Design a binder for this molecule. Structure first.
Ligand code: HEM
Ligand SMILES: CC1(C)[C@@H]2CC[C@@]1(C)C(=O)C2
Ligand SMILES: [C-]#N
Ligand SMILES: [K+]
Ligand SMILES: [K+]
Length: 405
């Protein structure tokens, strides 16, 4: 389904990649995206899919564009254009310096000191979930751990009832991996309609939860408006309900196939933070982008005002120019180069929370369930979009080889 090639785009730069359904998806989603890094593909290409847009395919270009907000604006950061135009989340839809005071507030509610404060609850929940699954000798990891672990931590931090999880999970899915069942705008509005009365309640009677803190925060010497609070809280919900969930599944899928990697971490758990970084590189999963603020020649390519450019965070660390043998998982790489949490002013506000959840998962799962595998004859399917993911991950193990703590 191909949009007519714009007059300014030369034909040798055309490469019709579909970010929502890449042709090589059966090989794994990262593998499917890595077709953009084969020798037949220029550094910067135009796809006619999804309305037509640029794709930067090398880490150097991706990093440069994320730094240059003057030319590459976050005002319209999603493909297709309809989604990007409807996108108004805070701080992501803002460029510097406007994003700054909102980002500071975001750091207050999902940043480091908050992680350090909730760390006991994070540890508690991982141990509880895993111990409950342990005697079963099987699970569907996506529904049984990857979802409830980070999502329940988020709902705890946000002071939201766990019964709202299915609905919010559906809406966030529609924004990052659309079904066709609803436009981005309709999904976004449903999320907003959920938040609107909660924000008003918590402006009236403030709590100490993330929503209360955002809704009662200060911007530019004045109170945050109910609208601004809604737009930021909406982003926090999307940010809290999708990426870590899907990332955990890619990592656990890998570990299920790699006993030697499991033992490295069990025997020398001080290597776990580096392993976290390497898995974040290899199983990177986000791809959003920017819109051109003006005509601009970038690496020899003429970009036009209003052109969209996908700058896949996923691709920087898979670029062989950034990491040798990029598809190999090597916990001992001297430098794990990646932009998995993004780059520039919008570098993920939740990255500390994400890392903690990952490192807790690695340690606590491998302690109790050191030996496990993918269920016999199970076909693991990945999905692709703004955030890529694992559809289902059936795991099996012999309970006799497990340990309670
Ligand atoms: C492995 C897990 C995660 C990954 C890979 C990831 C990735 C990213 C990326 C690539 C961006 C930048 C998007 C852009 O530049 O347009 C971003 C932004 C953001 N993320 Fe995450 N993230 C993760 C976990 C989390 C968590 C747990 C939260 C908690 C709510 C969170 C909240 C946010 C927020 C609020 C922003 C916006 C920052 C800004 O625009 O200034 N993220 N994330
Ligand atoms: C691209 C993102 C990962 C980043 C945080 C959530 C997300 C889906 C956004 O809308 C901005
Ligand atoms: C961020 N998600
Ligand atoms: K390329
Ligand atoms: K917009």
């Amino acid at each position: 389904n191909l949009a007519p090639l714009p007059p300014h785009v030369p034909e040798h730069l055309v490469f019709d990649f579909d970010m929502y359904n890449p042709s090589n998806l059966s090989a794994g989603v990262q593998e499917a995206w890595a077709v953009l890094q084969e020798s037949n593909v220029p550094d910067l290409v135009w796809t006619r899919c999804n309305g037509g847009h640029w794709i930067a395919t090398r880490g150097q270009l991706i990093r440069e564009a994320y730094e240059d907000y003057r030319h590459f604006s976050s005002e319209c950061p999603f493909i297709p254009r309809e989604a990007g135009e409807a996108y108004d989340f805070i701080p992501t839809s803002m460029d510097p310096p406007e994003q700054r005071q909102f980002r500071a507030l975001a750091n207050q509610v999902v940043g480091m000191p908050v992680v350090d404060k909730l760390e006991n609850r994070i540890q508690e929940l991982a141990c509880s979930l895993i111990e409950s699954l342990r005697p079963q000798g099987q699970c569907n990891f996506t529904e049984d751990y990857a979802e409830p672990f980070p999502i329940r931590i988020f709902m705890l931090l946000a002071g939201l009832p766990e019964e709202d999880i299915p609905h919010l999970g559906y809406l966030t899915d529609q924004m990052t991996r659309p079904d066709g069942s609803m436009t981005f705008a309709e999904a976004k509005e449903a999320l907003y309609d959920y938040l609107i009365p909660i924000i008003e309640q918590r402006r009236q009677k403030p709590g100490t939860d993330a929503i209360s803190i955002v809704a009662n925060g200060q911007v530019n010497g004045r109170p945050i408006t109910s609208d601004e609070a809604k737009r930021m809280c909406g982003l926090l919900l999307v940010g809290g309900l999708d990426t870590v969930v899907n990332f955990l599944s890619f990592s656990m899928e890998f570990l299920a196939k790699s006993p030697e990697h499991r033992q490295e971490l069990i025997e020398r758990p001080e290597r776990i933070p580096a392993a976290c970084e390497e898995l974040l590189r290899r199983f990177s999963l986000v791809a959003d982008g920017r819109i051109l603020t003006s005509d601009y020649e970038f690496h020899g390519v003429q970009l036009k005002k209003g052109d969209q450019i996908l700058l896949p965070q996923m691709l920087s660390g898979l670029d062989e120019r950034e990491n040798a043998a990029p598809m190999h998982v090597d916990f001992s790489r001297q430098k794990v180069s990646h932009t998995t949490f993004g780059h520039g002013s919008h570098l993920c506000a939740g990255q500390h929370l994400a890392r903690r959840e990952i490192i807790v998962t690695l340690k606590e799962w491998l302690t109790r369930i050191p030996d496990f595998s993918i269920a016999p004859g199970a076909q693991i399917q990945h999905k692709s979009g703004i955030v890529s993911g694992v559809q289902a991950l059936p795991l099996v193990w012999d309970p006799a080889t497990t340990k309670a703590v």
